[PDB]
mmCIF file of C-alpha atoms in Angstrom:
data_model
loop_
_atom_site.group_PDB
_atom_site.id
_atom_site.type_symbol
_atom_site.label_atom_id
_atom_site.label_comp_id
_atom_site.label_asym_id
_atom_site.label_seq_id
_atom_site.Cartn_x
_atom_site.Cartn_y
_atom_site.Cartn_z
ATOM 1 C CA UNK T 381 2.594 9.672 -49.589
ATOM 2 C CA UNK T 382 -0.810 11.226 -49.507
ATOM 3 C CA UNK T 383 -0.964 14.447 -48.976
ATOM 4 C CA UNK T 384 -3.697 15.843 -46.135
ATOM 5 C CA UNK T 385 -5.717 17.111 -48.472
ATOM 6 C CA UNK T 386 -6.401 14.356 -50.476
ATOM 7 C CA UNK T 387 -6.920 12.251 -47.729
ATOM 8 C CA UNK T 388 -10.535 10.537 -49.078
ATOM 9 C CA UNK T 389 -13.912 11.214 -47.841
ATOM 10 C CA UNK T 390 -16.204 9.489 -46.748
ATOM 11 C CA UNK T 391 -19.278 11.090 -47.613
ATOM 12 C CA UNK T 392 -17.318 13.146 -50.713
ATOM 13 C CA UNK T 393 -15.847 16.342 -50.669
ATOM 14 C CA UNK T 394 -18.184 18.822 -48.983
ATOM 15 C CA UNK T 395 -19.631 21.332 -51.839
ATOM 16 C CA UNK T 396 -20.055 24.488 -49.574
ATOM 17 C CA UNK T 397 -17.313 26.621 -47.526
ATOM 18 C CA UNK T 398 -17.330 27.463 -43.839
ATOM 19 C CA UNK T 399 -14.648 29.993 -41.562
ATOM 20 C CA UNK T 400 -13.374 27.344 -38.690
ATOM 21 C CA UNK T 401 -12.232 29.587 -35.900
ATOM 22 C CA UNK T 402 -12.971 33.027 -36.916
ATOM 23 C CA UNK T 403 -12.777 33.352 -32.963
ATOM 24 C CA UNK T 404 -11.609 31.698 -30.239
ATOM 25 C CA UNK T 405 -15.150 31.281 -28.920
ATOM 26 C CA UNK T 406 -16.372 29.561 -31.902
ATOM 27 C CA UNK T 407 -14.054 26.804 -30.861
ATOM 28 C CA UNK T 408 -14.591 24.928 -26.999
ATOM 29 C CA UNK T 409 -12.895 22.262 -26.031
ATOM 30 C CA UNK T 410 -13.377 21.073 -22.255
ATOM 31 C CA UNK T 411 -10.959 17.982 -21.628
ATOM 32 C CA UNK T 412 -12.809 14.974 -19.864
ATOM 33 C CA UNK T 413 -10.093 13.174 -17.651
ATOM 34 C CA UNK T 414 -12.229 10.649 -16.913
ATOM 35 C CA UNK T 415 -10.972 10.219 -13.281
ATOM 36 C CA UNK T 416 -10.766 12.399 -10.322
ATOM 37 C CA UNK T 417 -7.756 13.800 -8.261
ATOM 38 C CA UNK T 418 -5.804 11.357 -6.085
ATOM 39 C CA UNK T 419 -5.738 14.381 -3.089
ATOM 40 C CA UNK T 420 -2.785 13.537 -2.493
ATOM 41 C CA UNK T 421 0.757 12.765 -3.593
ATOM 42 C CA UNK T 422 4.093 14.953 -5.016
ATOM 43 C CA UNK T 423 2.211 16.430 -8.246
ATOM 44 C CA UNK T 424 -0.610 19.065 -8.073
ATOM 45 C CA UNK T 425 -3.248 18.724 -10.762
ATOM 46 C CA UNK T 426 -4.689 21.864 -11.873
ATOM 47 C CA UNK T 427 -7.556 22.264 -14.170
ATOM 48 C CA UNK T 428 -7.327 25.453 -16.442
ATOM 49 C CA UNK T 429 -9.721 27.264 -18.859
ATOM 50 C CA UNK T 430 -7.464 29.091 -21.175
ATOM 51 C CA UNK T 431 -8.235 32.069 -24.201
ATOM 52 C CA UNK T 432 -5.144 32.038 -26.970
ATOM 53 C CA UNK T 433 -2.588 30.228 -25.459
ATOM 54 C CA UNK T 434 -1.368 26.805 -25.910
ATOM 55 C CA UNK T 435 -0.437 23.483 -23.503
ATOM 56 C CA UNK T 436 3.064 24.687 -23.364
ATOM 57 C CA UNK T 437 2.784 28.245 -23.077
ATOM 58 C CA UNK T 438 0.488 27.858 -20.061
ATOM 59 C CA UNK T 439 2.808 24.959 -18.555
ATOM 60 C CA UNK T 440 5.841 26.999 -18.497
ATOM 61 C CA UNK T 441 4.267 30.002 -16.779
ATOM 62 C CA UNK T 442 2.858 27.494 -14.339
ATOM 63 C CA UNK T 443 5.847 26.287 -14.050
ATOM 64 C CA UNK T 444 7.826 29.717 -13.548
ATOM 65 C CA UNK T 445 5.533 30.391 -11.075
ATOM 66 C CA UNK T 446 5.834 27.409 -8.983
ATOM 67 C CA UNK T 447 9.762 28.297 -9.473
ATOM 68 C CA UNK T 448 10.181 24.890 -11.131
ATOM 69 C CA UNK T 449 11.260 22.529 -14.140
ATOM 70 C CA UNK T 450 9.464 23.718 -17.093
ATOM 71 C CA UNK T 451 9.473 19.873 -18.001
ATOM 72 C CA UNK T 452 7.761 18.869 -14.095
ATOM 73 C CA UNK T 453 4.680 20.447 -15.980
ATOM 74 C CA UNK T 454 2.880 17.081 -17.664
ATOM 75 C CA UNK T 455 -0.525 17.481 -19.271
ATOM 76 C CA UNK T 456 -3.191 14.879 -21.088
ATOM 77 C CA UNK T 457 -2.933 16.846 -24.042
ATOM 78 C CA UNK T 458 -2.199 19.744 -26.216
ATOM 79 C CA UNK T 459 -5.395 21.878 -26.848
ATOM 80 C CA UNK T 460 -5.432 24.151 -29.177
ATOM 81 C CA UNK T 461 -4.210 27.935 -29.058
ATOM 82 C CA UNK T 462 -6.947 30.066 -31.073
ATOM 83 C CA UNK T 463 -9.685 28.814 -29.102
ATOM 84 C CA UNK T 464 -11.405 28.537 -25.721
ATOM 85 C CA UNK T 465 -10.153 25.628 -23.604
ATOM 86 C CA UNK T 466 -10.573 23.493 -20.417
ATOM 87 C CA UNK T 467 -7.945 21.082 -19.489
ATOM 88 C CA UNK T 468 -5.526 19.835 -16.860
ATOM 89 C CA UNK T 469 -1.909 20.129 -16.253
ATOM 90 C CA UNK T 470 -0.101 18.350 -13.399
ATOM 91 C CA UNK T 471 3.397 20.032 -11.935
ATOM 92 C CA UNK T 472 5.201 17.713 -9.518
ATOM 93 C CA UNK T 473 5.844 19.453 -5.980
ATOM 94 C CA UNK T 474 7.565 18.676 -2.720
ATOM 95 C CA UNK T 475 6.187 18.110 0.039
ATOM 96 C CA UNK T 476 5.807 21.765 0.854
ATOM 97 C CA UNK T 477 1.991 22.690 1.508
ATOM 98 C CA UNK T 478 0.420 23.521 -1.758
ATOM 99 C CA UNK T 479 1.196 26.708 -3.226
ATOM 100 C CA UNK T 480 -1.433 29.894 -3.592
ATOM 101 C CA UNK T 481 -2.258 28.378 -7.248
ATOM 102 C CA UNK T 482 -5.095 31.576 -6.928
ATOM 103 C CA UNK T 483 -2.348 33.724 -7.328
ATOM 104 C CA UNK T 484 -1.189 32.359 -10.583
ATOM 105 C CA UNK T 485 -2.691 35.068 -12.824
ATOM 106 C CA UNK T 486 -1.819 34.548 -16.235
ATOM 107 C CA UNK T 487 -3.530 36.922 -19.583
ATOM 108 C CA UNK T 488 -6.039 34.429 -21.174
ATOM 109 C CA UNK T 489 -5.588 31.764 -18.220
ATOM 110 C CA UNK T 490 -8.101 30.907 -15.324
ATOM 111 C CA UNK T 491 -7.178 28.602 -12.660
ATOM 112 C CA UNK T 492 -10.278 26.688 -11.955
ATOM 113 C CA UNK T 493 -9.951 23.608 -9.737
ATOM 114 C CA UNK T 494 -6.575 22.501 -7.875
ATOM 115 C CA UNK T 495 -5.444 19.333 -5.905
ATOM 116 C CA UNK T 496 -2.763 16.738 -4.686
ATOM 117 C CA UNK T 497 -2.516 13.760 -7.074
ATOM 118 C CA UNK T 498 -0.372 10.727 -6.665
ATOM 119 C CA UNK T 499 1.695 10.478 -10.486
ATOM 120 C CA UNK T 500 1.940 12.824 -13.730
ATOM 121 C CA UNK T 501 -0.014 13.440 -16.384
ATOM 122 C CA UNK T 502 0.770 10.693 -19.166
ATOM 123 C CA UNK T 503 0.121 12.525 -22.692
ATOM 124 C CA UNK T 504 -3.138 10.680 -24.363
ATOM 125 C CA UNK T 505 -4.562 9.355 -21.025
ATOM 126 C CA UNK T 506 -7.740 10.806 -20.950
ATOM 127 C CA UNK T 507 -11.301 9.511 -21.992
ATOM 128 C CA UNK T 508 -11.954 12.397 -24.505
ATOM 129 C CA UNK T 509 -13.182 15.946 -25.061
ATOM 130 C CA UNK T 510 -16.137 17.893 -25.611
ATOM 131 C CA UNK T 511 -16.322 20.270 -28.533
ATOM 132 C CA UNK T 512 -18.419 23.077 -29.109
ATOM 133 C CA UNK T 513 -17.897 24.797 -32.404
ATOM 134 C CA UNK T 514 -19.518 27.297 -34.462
ATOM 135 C CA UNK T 515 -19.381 27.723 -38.354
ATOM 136 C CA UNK T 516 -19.442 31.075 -40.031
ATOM 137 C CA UNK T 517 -20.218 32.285 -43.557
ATOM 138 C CA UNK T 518 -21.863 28.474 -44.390
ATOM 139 C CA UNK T 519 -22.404 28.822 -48.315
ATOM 140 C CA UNK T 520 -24.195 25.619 -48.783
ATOM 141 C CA UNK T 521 -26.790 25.214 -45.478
ATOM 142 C CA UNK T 522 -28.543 22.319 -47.368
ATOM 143 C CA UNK T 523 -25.524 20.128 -47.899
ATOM 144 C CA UNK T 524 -23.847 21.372 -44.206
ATOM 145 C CA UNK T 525 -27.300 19.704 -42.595
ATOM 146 C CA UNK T 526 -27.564 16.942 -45.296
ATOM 147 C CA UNK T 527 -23.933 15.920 -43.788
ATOM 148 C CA UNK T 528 -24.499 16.511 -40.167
ATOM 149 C CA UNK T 529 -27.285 13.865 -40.504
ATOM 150 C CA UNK T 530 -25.870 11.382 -42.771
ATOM 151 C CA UNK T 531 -22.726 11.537 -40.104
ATOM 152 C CA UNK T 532 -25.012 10.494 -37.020
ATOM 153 C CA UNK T 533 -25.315 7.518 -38.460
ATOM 154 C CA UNK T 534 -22.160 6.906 -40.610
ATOM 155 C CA UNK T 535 -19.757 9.114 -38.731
ATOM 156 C CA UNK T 536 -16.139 10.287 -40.714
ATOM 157 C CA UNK T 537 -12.749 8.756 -41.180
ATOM 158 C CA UNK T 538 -10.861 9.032 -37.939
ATOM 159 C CA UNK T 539 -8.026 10.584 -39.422
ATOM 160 C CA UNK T 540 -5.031 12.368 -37.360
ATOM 161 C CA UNK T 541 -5.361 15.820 -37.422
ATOM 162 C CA UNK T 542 -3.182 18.192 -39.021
ATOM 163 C CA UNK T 543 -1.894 19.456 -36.047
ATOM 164 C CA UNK T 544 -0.258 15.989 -35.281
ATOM 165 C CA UNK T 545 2.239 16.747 -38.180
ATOM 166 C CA UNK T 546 3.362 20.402 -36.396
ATOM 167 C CA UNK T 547 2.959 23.658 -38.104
ATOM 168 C CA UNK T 548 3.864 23.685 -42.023
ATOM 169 C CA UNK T 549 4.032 20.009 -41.184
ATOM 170 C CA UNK T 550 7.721 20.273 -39.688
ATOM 171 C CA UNK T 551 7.187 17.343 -37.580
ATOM 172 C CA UNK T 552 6.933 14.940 -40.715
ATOM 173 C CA UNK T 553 9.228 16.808 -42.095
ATOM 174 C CA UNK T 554 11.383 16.065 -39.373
ATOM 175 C CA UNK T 555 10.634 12.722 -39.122
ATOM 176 C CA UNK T 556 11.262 11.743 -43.213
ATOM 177 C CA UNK T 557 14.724 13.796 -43.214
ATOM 178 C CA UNK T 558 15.960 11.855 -39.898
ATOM 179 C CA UNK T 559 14.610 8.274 -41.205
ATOM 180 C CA UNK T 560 17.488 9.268 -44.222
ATOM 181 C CA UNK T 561 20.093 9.433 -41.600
ATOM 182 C CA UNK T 562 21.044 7.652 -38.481
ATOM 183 C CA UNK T 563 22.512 10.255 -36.299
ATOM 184 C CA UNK T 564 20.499 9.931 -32.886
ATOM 185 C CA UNK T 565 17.839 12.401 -32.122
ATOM 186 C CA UNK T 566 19.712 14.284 -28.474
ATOM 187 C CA UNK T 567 16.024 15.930 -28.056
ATOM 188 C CA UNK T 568 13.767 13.678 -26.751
ATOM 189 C CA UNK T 569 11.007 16.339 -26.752
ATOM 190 C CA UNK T 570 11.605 16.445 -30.903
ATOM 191 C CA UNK T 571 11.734 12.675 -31.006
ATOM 192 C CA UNK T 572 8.365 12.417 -29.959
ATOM 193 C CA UNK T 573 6.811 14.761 -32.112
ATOM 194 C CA UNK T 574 8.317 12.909 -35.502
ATOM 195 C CA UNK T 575 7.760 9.238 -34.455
ATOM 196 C CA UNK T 576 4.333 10.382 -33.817
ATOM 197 C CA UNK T 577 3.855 12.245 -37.361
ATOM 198 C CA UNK T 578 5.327 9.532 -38.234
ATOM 199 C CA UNK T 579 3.234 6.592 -37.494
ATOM 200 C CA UNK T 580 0.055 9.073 -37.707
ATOM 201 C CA UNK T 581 1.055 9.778 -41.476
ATOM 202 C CA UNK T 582 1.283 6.054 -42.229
ATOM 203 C CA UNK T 583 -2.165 5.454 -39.947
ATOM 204 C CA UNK T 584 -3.775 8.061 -41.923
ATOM 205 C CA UNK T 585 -2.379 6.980 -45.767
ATOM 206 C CA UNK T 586 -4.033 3.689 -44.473
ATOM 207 C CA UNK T 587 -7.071 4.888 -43.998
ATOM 208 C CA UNK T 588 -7.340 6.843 -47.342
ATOM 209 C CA UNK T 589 -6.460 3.980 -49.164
ATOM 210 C CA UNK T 590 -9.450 1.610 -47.284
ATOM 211 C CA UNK T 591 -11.840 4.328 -48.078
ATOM 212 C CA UNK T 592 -11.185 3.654 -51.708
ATOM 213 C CA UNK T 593 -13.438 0.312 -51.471
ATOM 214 C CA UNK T 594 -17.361 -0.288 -52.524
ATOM 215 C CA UNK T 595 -17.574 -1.203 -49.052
ATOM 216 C CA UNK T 596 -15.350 0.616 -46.421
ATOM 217 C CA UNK T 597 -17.005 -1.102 -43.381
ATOM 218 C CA UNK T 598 -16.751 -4.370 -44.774
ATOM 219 C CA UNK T 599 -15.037 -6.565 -42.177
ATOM 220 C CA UNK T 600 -12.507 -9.083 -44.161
ATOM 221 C CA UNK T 601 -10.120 -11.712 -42.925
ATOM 222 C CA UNK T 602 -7.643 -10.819 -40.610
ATOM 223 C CA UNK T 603 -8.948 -7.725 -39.657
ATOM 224 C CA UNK T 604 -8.178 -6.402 -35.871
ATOM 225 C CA UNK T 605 -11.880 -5.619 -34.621
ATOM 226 C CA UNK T 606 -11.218 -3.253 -31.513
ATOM 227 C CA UNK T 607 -14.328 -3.260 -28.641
ATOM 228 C CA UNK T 608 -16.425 0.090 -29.014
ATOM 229 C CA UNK T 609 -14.807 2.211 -26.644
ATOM 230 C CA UNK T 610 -11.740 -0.079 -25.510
ATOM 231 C CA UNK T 611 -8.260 -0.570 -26.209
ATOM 232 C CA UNK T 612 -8.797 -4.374 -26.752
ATOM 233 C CA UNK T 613 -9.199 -5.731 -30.229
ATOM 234 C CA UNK T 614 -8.944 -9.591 -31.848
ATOM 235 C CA UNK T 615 -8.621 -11.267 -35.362
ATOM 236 C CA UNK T 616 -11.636 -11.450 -37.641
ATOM 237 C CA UNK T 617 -11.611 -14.524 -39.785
ATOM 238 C CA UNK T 618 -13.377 -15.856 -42.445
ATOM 239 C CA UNK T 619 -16.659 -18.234 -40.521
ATOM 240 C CA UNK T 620 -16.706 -15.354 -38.059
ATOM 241 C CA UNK T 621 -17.380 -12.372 -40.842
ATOM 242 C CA UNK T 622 -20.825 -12.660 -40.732
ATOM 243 C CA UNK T 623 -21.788 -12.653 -37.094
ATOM 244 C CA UNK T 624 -18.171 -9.745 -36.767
ATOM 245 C CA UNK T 625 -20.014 -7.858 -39.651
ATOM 246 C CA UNK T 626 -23.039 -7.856 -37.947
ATOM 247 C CA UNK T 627 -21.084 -6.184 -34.817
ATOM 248 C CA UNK T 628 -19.122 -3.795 -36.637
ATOM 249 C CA UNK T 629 -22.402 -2.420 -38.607
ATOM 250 C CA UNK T 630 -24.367 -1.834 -34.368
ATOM 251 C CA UNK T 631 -21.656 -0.291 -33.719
ATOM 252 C CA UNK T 632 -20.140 -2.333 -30.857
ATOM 253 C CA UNK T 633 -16.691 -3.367 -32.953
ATOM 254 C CA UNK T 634 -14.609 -0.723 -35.008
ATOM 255 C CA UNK T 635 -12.725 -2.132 -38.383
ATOM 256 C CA UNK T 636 -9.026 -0.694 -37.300
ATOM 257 C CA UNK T 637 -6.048 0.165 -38.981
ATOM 258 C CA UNK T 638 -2.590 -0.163 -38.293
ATOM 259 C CA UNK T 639 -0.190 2.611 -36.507
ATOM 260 C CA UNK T 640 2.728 0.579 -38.342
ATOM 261 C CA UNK T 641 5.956 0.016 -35.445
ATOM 262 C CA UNK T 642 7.723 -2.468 -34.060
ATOM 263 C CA UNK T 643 6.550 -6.149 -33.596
ATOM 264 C CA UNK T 644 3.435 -7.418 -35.513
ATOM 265 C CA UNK T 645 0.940 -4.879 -36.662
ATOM 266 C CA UNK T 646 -1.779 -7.086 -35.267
ATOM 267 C CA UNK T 647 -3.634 -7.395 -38.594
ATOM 268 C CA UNK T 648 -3.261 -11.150 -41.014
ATOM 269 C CA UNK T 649 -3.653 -12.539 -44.047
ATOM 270 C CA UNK T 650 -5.677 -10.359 -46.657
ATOM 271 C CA UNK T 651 -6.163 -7.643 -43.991
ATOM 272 C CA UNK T 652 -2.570 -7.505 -43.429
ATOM 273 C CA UNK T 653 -1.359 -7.888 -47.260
ATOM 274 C CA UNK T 654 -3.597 -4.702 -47.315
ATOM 275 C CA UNK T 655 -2.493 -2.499 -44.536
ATOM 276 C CA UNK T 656 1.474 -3.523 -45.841
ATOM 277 C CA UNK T 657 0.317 -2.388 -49.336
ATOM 278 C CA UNK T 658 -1.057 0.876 -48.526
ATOM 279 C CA UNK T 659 2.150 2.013 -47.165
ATOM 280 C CA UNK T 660 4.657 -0.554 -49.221
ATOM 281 C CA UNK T 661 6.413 2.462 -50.296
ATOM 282 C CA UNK T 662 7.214 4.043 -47.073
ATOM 283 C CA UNK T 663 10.107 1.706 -46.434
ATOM 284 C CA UNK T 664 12.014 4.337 -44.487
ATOM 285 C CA UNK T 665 9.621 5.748 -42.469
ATOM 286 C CA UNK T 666 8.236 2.145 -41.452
ATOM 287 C CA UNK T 667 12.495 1.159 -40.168
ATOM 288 C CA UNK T 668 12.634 4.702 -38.441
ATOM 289 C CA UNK T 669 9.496 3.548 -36.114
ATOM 290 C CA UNK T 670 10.953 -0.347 -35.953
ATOM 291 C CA UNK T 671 14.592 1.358 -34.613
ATOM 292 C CA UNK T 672 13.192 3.687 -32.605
ATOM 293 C CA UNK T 673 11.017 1.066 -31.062
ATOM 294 C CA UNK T 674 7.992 2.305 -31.024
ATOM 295 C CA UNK T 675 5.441 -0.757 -30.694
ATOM 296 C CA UNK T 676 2.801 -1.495 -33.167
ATOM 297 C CA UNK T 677 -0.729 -0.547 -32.825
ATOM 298 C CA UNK T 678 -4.589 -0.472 -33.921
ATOM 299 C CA UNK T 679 -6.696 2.604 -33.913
ATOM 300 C CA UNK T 680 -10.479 2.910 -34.953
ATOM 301 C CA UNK T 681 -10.606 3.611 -38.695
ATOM 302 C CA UNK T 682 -13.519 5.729 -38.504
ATOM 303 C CA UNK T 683 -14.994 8.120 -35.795
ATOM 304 C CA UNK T 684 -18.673 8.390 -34.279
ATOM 305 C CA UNK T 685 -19.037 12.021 -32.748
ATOM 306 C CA UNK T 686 -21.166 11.162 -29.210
ATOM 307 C CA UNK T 687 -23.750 13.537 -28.414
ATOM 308 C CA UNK T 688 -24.192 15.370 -31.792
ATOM 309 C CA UNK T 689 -26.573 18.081 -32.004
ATOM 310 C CA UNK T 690 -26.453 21.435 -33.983
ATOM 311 C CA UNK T 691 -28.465 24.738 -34.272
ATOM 312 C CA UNK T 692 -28.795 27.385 -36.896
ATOM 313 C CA UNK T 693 -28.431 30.645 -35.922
ATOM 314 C CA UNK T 694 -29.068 31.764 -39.386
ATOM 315 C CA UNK T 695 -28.859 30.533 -42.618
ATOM 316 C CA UNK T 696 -24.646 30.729 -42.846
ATOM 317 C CA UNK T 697 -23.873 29.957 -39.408
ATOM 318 C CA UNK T 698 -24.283 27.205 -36.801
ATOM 319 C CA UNK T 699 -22.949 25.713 -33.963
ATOM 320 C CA UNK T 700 -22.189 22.261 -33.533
ATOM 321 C CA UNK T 701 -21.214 20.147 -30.666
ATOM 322 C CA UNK T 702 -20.326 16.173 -29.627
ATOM 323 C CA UNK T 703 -17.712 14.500 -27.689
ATOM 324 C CA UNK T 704 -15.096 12.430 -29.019
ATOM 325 C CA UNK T 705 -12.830 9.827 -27.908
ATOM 326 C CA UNK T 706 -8.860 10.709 -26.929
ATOM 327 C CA UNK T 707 -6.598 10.881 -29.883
ATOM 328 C CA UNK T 708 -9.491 11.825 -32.283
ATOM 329 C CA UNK T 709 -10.032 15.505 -33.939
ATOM 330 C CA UNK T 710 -12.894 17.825 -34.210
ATOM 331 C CA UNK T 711 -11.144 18.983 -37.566
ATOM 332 C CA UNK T 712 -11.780 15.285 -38.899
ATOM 333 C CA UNK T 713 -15.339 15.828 -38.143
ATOM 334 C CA UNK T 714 -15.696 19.487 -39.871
ATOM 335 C CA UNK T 715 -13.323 18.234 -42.768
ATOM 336 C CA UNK T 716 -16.688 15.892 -44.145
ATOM 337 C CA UNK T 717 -18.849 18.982 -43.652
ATOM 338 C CA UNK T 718 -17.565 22.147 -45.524
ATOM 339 C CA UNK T 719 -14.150 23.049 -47.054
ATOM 340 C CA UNK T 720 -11.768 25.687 -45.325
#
């Protein structure tokens, strides 16, 4: 399987180094629900700005506070630790008036905004987050700039980021060892993480392998064309390729590639003999996703940061900032721009 970092570029290997991080600062993230508290209900969303701590260290003090499950304590997401960010967490309540969520003091953690909403926080429902980042010790300015332009236009490979394989990559790890085995996975918590490195190793191997083409953006028979900022997606096919290529090139349909599971992957013919290639050896990984049924799906094969503007500071450091969709990485974005 292909290894992170030889995932392919799509604008080459940068040919200039950066520090990602150096601070938690230099890396904002404010979540972007994308809808507004119910008011009422038996959860209690909270929105939080947090310094060094992640989704689950800040959900079970919430939830230690409120004197409850540590697992009542749902969230859109997992932001990252060593950085600045805004998000919200839901904790399901009884009917007892609202606790003093003002009193929740926490070291690095800010309560910011509290009401009564009607369900929990499903992970991945959200509409996306906005990034502000800053780059230190840039040895190559010229090619940086060169790449922050070029990606306006052609954006980068929406690859998973390394996160979504846990730290030292345990959670693929995980996920190969117990597709060599059948014993049943007692920790539901754990059998989320794998399947999900899972399918977002095979998504990702995909991808890499697409990227290999003249044309990457080329739409070819079969392919599932998703609607620019929707779930929805149909079947390209071979009178249509034209008038879908035309589409795909404005922007308004994205070329997608599988997130192999149960069922059909969605792609057919050529398009499908392709995506079934790129991961033909992955036999075991590909039944561990079937069994566990976890149903097929598309996701955009590359990315197109909204909003992107930059500034220099000086000539080695600048900060950089767009929005992107749910499910889709800031580190995919500074991965095409300077090597760490």
């Amino acid at each position: 399987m292909i290894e992170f970092d030889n995932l392919t570029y799509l604008h080459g290997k940068p040919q200039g180094t950066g520090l990602l991080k150096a601070n938690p600062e230099d890396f904002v993230v404010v979540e972007d629900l994308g809808f507004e508290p119910d008011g009422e209900g038996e959860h209690i969303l909270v929105r939080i700005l947090k310094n060094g701590c992640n989704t689950r260290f800040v959900a079970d003090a919430l939830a230690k506070f409120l004197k409850i499950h540590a697992r009542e304590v749902s969230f859109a997401g997992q932001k990252d630790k060593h950085a600045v960010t805004e998000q919200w967490l839901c904790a399901r309540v009884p009917g007892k008036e609202m606790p003093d969520l003002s009193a929740f003091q926490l070291e690095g953690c800010q309560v910011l905004e509290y009401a009564r909403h009607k369900r929990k926080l499903r992970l991945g429902a959200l509409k996306g987050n906005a990034f502000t980042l800053v780059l230190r010790e840039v040895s190559n300015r010229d090619d940086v700039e060169q790449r922050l332009i070029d990606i306006c236009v052609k954006g980068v490979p929406n690859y998973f980021g390394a996160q979504r394989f846990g730290i030292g990559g345990s959670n693929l790890q995980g996920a190969q060892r117990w597709a060599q085995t059948n014993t049943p996975v007692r920790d539901r918590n754990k059998r989320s993480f794998w399947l999900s490195a899972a399918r977002s190793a095979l998504f990702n191997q995909i991808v890499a392998e697409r990227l290999k083409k003249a044309d990457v953006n080329q739409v070819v028979d079969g392919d599932a064309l998703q609607l620019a900022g929707r779930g929805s997606w149909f079947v390209a096919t071979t009178e249509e390729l034209a008038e879908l290529q035309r589409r795909v090139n404005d922007k308004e349909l994205m070329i997608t590639a599988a997130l192999p599971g149960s069922g059909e992957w969605g792609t057919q013919r050529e398009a499908l003999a392709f995506e079934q290639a790129a991961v033909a050896a992955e036999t075991e990984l590909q039944a561990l996703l079937v069994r566990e049924k976890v149903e097929a799906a598309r996701r955009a094969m590359l990315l197109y940061p909204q909003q992107l503007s930059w500034n220099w500071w000086d000539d080695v450091t600048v900060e950089i900032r767009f929005w992107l969709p749910a499910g889709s990485f800031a580190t995919s974005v500074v991965r095409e721009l300077i090597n760490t």
